[PDB]
Amino acid sequence: RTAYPYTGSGYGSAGVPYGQDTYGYKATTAKSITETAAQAGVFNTF
Amino acid sequence: PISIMGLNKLVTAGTAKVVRADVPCANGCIIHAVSSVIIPPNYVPVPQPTKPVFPRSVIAEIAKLPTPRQALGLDP
Amino acid sequence: MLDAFSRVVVNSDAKAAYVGGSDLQALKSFIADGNKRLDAVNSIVSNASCMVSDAVSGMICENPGLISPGGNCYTNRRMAACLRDGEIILRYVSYALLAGDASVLEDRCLNGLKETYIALGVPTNSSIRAVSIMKAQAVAFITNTATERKMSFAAGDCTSLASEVASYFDRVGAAIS
Amino acid sequence: MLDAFSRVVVNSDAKAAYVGGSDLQALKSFIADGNKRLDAVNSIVSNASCMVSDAVSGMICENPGLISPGGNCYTNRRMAACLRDGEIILRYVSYALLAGDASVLEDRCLNGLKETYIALGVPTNSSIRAVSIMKAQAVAFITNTATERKMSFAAGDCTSLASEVASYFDRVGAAIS
Amino acid sequence: KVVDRLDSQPSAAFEQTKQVYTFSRYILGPHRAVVAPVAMDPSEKEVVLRAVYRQVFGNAYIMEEERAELRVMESQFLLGELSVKELVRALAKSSTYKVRFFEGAVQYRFIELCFKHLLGRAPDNHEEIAVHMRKYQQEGYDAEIDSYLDAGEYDNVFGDDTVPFLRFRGVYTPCDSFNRQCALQGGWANSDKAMGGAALSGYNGSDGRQMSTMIGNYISGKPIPYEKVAADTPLKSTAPNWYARPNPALAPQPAYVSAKEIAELRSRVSKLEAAWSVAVKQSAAAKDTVETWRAAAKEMAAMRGISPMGEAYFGGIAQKVDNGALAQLGNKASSYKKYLYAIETDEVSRLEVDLEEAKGQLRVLEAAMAKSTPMTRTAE
Amino acid sequence: MKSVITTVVSAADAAGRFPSNSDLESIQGNIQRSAARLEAAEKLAGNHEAVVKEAGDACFAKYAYLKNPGEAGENQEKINKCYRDVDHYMRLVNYCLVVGGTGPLDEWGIAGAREVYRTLNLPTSAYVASIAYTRDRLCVPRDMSAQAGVEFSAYLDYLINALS
Amino acid sequence: MKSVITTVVSAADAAGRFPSNSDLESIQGNIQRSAARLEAAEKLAGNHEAVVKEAGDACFAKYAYLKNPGEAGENQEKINKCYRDVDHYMRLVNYCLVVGGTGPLDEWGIAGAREVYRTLNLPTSAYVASIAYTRDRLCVPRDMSAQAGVEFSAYLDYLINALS
Amino acid sequence: MKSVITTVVSAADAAGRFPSNSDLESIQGNIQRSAARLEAAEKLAGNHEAVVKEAGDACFAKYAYLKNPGEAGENQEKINKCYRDVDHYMRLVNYCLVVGGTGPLDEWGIAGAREVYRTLNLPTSAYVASIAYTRDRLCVPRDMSAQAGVEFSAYLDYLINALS
Amino acid sequence: MKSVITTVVSAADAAGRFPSNSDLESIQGNIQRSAARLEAAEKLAGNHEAVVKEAGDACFAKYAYLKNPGEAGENQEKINKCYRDVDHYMRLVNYCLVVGGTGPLDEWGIAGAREVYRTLNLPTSAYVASIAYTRDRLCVPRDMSAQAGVEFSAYLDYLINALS
């Protein structure tokens, strides 16, 4: 019973894996400036 | 130098007034969408292309140079 | 409304802090350059009557349909009213340069300006340039590089005040953009 | 605004009915229980000042960020207004319990009170909590079952009037939600 | 008992400002009471005359060529037999007033302007608007200006020497009427020529049609939308410049919204206000770890008292005493400072604040999704 | 509507006060009188078709010029349109005998009552003659009791003066 | 002075109506409500010295710091000024009984009282300590009749809500 | 707020005038008087917890009745919410010295305090016996400079004048 | 007259306040900037015959059309009223440097000046050709000091801007 539970396994935890998915250091899903703009389709001229 | 100030949740970069706040990117960079193009402060527009002009007469060149007499006030 | 001294009070209030050692030092350099600020406001209120006709008439020569019939600056009462909002805007930017903070621009100069231009029919693209020309005039008077009027100051630079007054002339140029 | 006795009239004219022995029965029983209603409305107005401090401060102890720098009962200005909007709602509720009709309430406070707090930036469901504590205090006073104060009455059942005053306090809840 | 008398009543004999104005938005902005003193300098007869032309004309541009209509009753004020309540009666009965706000105005728009200009108050209910229409149709324009001013409300509020101001009364008799006047005085940089469309409807700025929006909210009792109370408003001209944690100002309606990001945000507030209902119930009894031991740690708390401060030698060593009220409990300076950091440290207040920023973002993201057919969209 | 309760919760609302002991007593006054005047309402609604029958002709027992050509009682169906009106004003008495005050009279029978009468050739001299033969014909031990009879005799004289 | 009669003929003056039968509703209840409150009038007005004596040391037992040097009871001629102040308030209570409204209290005793005491350094908590005490030494079937004590104990905490 | 700058820009904007030389003259007096009152704000920032602790128990040593059950010092939770109020008033005086005039004490510390102290039954003499203690502890060459002690004890007396 | 001591008293009376530490701090600026505008006020009190002369003909050198018939400066009796007017403006600038603000120039020389010069056909471009000549004639180490040639030049083009 809470609102913001801490993440971790073992004793003294809340039931949430580390980093919310067992991924402490997650990989970058975002892409470069030049291709995140070309993907949106409104930074065409820029 | 450029000024960025968000007051009353109205973020404007110079004369921009951001419409779309944040778009996270690859190398921890941020992208904002602005409604105008920001011109640099000390920007002078490059002039249109022109044809080179040359002095028609050389005597008219000398006719516009003041002499030492005119510089002293002894002549008209 | 706020000035530079009370803006750092309401940011220290956001942290329940006393205005202490590291926050009282930036205000002691606001008064250490307090005479250049008074010397810079005086450059603008001196030439103010010719600042708003150098700009409004410089807008007519670029967009000449403003005085064409049906235009926004067409009659005498329409041209008269454009010169009164020309100097109201310069009057509020002078208070922001004096106070050191753009609160008066947000609280009462721009509080409804974009909506009142659309409700009247003022072309907002031309009224940027009436504010953008006054920015070129004011940074010429503060750095003392006006090409037809020079005023007498002590030696030093006012590069920082000329940059700050540029920030108020395009907070107005973006809050109606 | 309307009353109980006007309410049969504002329904009967839509059929244009002579109100003979048709629907008077909830009105002869209305004035029959007039004294035990007057004995019930006096219970609130004798304790109304100590109700709204009991209720506003009780809202604070459940949400103590309201008095930190930032919260909407921080300064003495924000506390004195919130202590006043508790007094206005308890005053219209005592009017609705006095006439036995709700149409003094929703045309004089609840019309547009939701859009007001969205404009002023008052958090909604903490203000729900303060009307909720005043609901729990009114049904205690009418049944004479408050913990730390008792008033003397002629003995009789007053669980019906306590349901009526509770039926108005959640109309405030349906407004500002 | 918080307030003792409203502003609709006359002031009592023992105050300078009314009580309801002392903690209202009256103290925070330019909408205050300017009074004419007993003997007036000609320079400070302009300070009372510029304030009248602000209010009674509603930030209009009185040019020099059209201020020459008013010099006959200007000078009758500058001499001093026309009080401020009698100057505004003649100014309303003028010609430059009837051209601006009467001769192209629908009868709803003329009454609600007279409510803004003469009184400091947007129209309250509908049968008040109806009875002021029924003067003009039966008595003409002339006696109708005596309806606003020759009643009890002008004498009790403004007297005869205060210029009219937009009242921030505290107590509003419907709570809808606090937004009706907030939409009518809509901006420091606004004027009724713009808000009524009286420059775009006519020819070269003249021949304007002074038409009203929000007519239906008078007849059908319907609230004003919250955007018209927070965008151009008297609440920005009287902005408190606080650190409000729900910041009330509305963000600009963005270009490029998408129905995906509205659906994550809409679900997000349902996770938060369901959590708020189950966290507010849990608190107030078992929230505190050191509370069940407080009655046991308090029973044995007092022993080996001390009068002259500095006893408890503990084997003949110094070891003094504080004897203060705070430190007798064992508290420090950080014992009262913890109440200032409970804005985000707390769990009941962290939920509520994070809820209120989400319905702030949701109220403008939804309303931007009201423009449909030729919409060019994005990839976030 | 102008009732006993609507004043007290507005004579306090203008002052912004709570119901006081003067305020709660004003509804105690709306109990003892309220019996004998709520008693004055069902007797009206019982034989309501006769008090308009005895006034639907006394209005014509004064004036015979109403039945002249061109006038308002010039035919039969507008006498029935007249009967619908005299049906209404005593029915609004039945409404204000249960409210306690004169609320539905000045909200539904007095508002605009002049500017339709003179406009549409409706002379009030025969309207008050219909209500006159209502008034003093009332036999106070037959129709009701004494203290119940003053409450009926008061209200119809309120629109005697209001309609003229 | 706010009475029952004062608040009905003031609202009649705001419209311009005559004294209505709606306004005769209220004062009929005033005669029955004054069987109670006028009985408690002379019960105060024959025994007011013994009440105000007991309330004085009830104030001074709870707040015995008032007899410190520098406070608001530091000599006997400040204590004497105190014992007549609580006899002023008991005198206005006797006035609100016979008038029947909040009028004689919120004009002669309340309006401005928070301004005087905040300047003369009088703690207003000491004032309610003698009013809340004499609120509840009234035991109902011995002091008066049962209905007089409910008006006695209603003006007394109109006072306590005002000053607190 | 209420500062030197805000008074000369709001009186100008009421007139419609640019900043004239009468305005820039008054902002020069903000430069001479600056370092006196920016020297007392820094003395308050680094020593407030020792001031508030000493100013707070002066309230309870003077009035020890507050720690009784029933009053505003009955437990440890209300006592901590007492020393915090002194630290609120002391932090606003530090904000007044930085701004220049009585801006922060008016809008954040006074405007409504006459109401929230009457409702919650907080005695206001207990507030001013804490502020008057610190005004009388000021040893004007030891604590700060002599002109800073004028600027410090000016807002201290401004606050006592507003609460009393 | 508009000055520092009038505007901080008129503002502190609009609210009904005692003079505060932001009202006093303004008048400390009236002390620092008085030693520069008083030696630009006596510097004009002695030499004022030579400056009305040197600037009164600067217009007539510029606008030589003014002495044609029908015009303003057509004859010597109108030229003498013209040299009197530049004396009038120089006297008020001497008044303004004594008070500290532009109260004399406003109340005596500016207020109503557009109503007359349009009526009497006076070209205000000639009036500003005099005042602008006096402005740039100044040699700021020779004529007066540096910060006195700030104060003298400030009121000189406030008059230009109020005529332009």
Ligand SMILES: *[C@@H](C)[C@H]1/C(=C/C2=NC(=C\c3[nH]c(C[C@H]4NC(=O)C(C=C)=C4C)c(C)c3CCC(=O)O)/C(CCC(=O)O)=C2C)NC(=O)[C@@H]1C
């Ligand atoms: C930048 C805008 C200029 C420039 C400005 C400088 N001004 C300097 C000193 C200065 N200015 C004034 C006058 C000002 N103070 C007032 O109180 C009033 C009116 C009430 C005014 C107009 C004064 C008094 C001073 C101080 C020196 C003096 O005159 O005694 C200044 C010197 C640096 C400093 O004082 O901190 C600078 C650099 N100078 C420039 O080069 C650009 C063009």
Ligand SMILES: *[C@@H](C)[C@H]1/C(=C/C2=NC(=C\c3[nH]c(C[C@H]4NC(=O)C(C=C)=C4C)c(C)c3CCC(=O)O)/C(CCC(=O)O)=C2C)NC(=O)[C@@H]1C
């Ligand atoms: C004693 C239990 C009190 C207390 C009483 C004191 N009151 C003092 C002065 C005072 N009291 C009033 C109000 C009173 N006079 C009236 O005429 C009416 C109602 C019609 C009331 C309620 C006034 C107006 C004054 C000032 C004028 C005067 O002295 O008569 C007083 C003297 C204090 C002083 O003058 O320094 C005392 C001691 N003080 C207490 O400690 C408890 C609360």
Ligand SMILES: *[C@@H](C)[C@H]1/C(=C/C2=NC(=C\c3[nH]c(C[C@H]4NC(=O)C(C=C)=C4C)c(C)c3CCC(=O)O)/C(CCC(=O)O)=C2C)NC(=O)[C@@H]1C
């Ligand atoms: C202790 C020496 C005091 C005392 C203090 C109490 N104050 C209580 C509540 C309270 N105080 C204020 C005003 C304060 N809050 C602010 O934000 C500012 C300025 C920025 C100030 C001066 C408020 C608004 C409140 C209510 C909310 C809150 O709890 O903070 C209090 C609690 C009373 C209660 O819970 O019933 C106490 C005990 N009490 C004393 O005896 C002296 C006067």
Ligand SMILES: *[C@@H](C)[C@H]1/C(=C/C2=NC(=C\c3[nH]c(C[C@H]4NC(=O)C(C=C)=C4C)c(C)c3CCC(=O)O)/C(CCC(=O)O)=C2C)NC(=O)[C@@H]1C
């Ligand atoms: C500095 C080298 C200047 C410069 C100065 C000269 N001024 C000359 C004469 C002159 N100056 C004034 C104005 C003087 N009187 C005042 O009351 C004030 C301030 C209010 C000032 C500055 C007057 C009125 C006159 C004419 C009468 C007189 O001499 O006193 C002057 C002699 C030339 C001449 O008289 O025509 C010089 C050299 N000249 C310069 O080139 C730089 C800018």
Ligand SMILES: *[C@H](C)[C@H]1/C(=C/C2=NC(=C\c3[nH]c(C[C@H]4NC(=O)C(C=C)=C4C)c(C)c3CCC(=O)O)/C(CCC(=O)O)=C2C)NC(=O)[C@@H]1C
């Ligand atoms: C001039 C640079 C513009 C232009 C301006 C026009 N404005 C007209 C009316 C008007 N303008 C304002 C703006 C002004 N008033 C303020 O209070 C503030 C901020 C403090 C500002 C910036 C207002 C309020 C109004 C309405 C005035 C009224 O009610 O009469 C206007 C038309 C006037 C008329 O129709 O009589 C014009 C032409 N137009 C332009 O083309 C340039 C770009």
Ligand SMILES: *[C@H](C)[C@H]1/C(=C/C2=NC(=C\c3[nH]c(C[C@H]4NC(=O)C(C=C)=C4C)c(C)c3CCC(=O)O)/C(CCC(=O)O)=C2C)NC(=O)[C@@H]1C
């Ligand atoms: C208290 C339990 C709340 C809370 C209240 C605040 N309300 C503030 C201003 C305000 N409050 C109302 C409500 C009330 N006044 C009325 O007139 C009527 C109906 C006729 C009602 C229900 C209104 C209308 C206003 C605005 C009017 C005005 O300011 O004059 C307020 C001040 C906000 C500010 O100063 O910006 C507060 C703090 N806030 C809370 O946190 C609790 C939940």
Ligand SMILES: C=CC1=C(C)[C@@H](Cc2[nH]c(/C=C3N=C(/C=C4\NC(=O)[C@H](C)[C@H]4CC)C(C)=C\3CCC(=O)O)c(CCC(=O)O)c2C)NC1=O
């Ligand atoms: C079509 C018509 C037309 C005009 C009217 C001018 C208007 C004008 N002036 C400036 C630029 C400027 N304008 C002024 C204004 C003035 N100079 C003074 O000293 C006086 C006080 C005031 C004239 C009354 C100043 C000071 C500058 C800066 C450079 C300088 O003049 O020294 C600029 C910006 C730079 C540029 O785009 O060239 C413009 C558009 N230009 C035009 O093309």
Ligand SMILES: C=CC1=C(C)[C@@H](Cc2[nH]c(/C=C3N=C(/C=C4\NC(=O)[C@H](C)[C@H]4CC)C(C)=C\3CCC(=O)O)c(CCC(=O)O)c2C)NC1=O
């Ligand atoms: C002007 C002010 C004014 C009032 C306040 C009332 C006062 C009042 N209350 C009651 C009388 C009563 N009041 C109650 C009410 C209650 N008893 C309970 O056990 C419950 C706790 C509570 C209801 C919630 C009951 C049960 C009676 C008696 C029965 C009845 O009146 O029908 C009576 C009739 C008995 C008597 O003669 O005293 C009166 C006059 N009348 C007034 O004129």
Ligand SMILES: C=CC1=C(C)[C@@H](Cc2[nH]c(/C=C3N=C(/C=C4\NC(=O)[C@H](C)[C@H]4CC)C(C)=C\3CCC(=O)O)c(CCC(=O)O)c2C)NC1=O
């Ligand atoms: C964190 C701080 C905090 C508070 C301030 C209180 C606030 C408070 N009081 C009550 C509940 C109540 N509150 C009152 C109010 C009062 N009682 C009286 O007799 C007086 C007239 C008046 C105080 C002056 C009353 C009458 C009840 C009903 C029960 C009773 O007290 O007999 C309730 C609802 C019931 C509950 O949830 O417990 C709450 C939240 N509780 C808290 O946790």
Ligand SMILES: C=CC1=C(C)[C@@H](Cc2[nH]c(/C=C3N=C(/C=C4\NC(=O)[C@H](C)[C@H]4CC)C(C)=C\3CCC(=O)O)c(CCC(=O)O)c2C)NC1=O
């Ligand atoms: C709502 C209240 C109400 C009433 C008061 C009566 C009013 C009334 N009375 C009578 C009818 C009558 N009323 C009376 C009584 C009297 N006639 C007199 O002239 C004496 C003054 C008085 C003696 C006491 C008599 C004798 C009749 C029979 C015919 C007549 O005289 O009118 C009629 C004619 C139709 C009928 O019989 O009902 C009506 C409407 N009906 C009502 O519905």
Ligand SMILES: C=CC1=C(C)[C@@H](Cc2[nH]c(/C=C3N=C(/C=C4\NC(=O)[C@H](C)[C@H]4CC)C(C)=C\3CCC(=O)O)c(CCC(=O)O)c2C)NC1=O
């Ligand atoms: C914000 C401003 C500010 C203050 C005014 C002081 C207030 C103050 N003064 C003293 C402490 C002291 N203050 C004095 C001064 C005096 N004692 C006398 O008898 C003389 C009348 C007077 C000289 C003017 C002395 C002698 C002490 C040390 C002894 C003591 O504590 O009483 C202390 C105890 C801690 C300390 O030593 O500093 C504090 C909090 N501190 C502050 O931060």
Ligand SMILES: C=CC1=C(C)[C@@H](Cc2[nH]c(/C=C3N=C(/C=C4\NC(=O)[C@H](C)[C@H]4CC)C(C)=C\3CCC(=O)O)c(CCC(=O)O)c2C)NC1=O
């Ligand atoms: C205290 C401030 C103050 C002033 C400045 C003057 C302003 C002023 N000047 C004139 C009056 C005049 N002013 C001029 C002025 C000029 N003629 C020219 O060729 C140039 C345009 C210009 C000066 C070089 C002339 C010629 C007259 C006389 C015009 C006439 O009477 O028709 C008048 C009309 C009354 C009169 O003739 O005296 C007034 C009020 N008066 C004042 O009280």
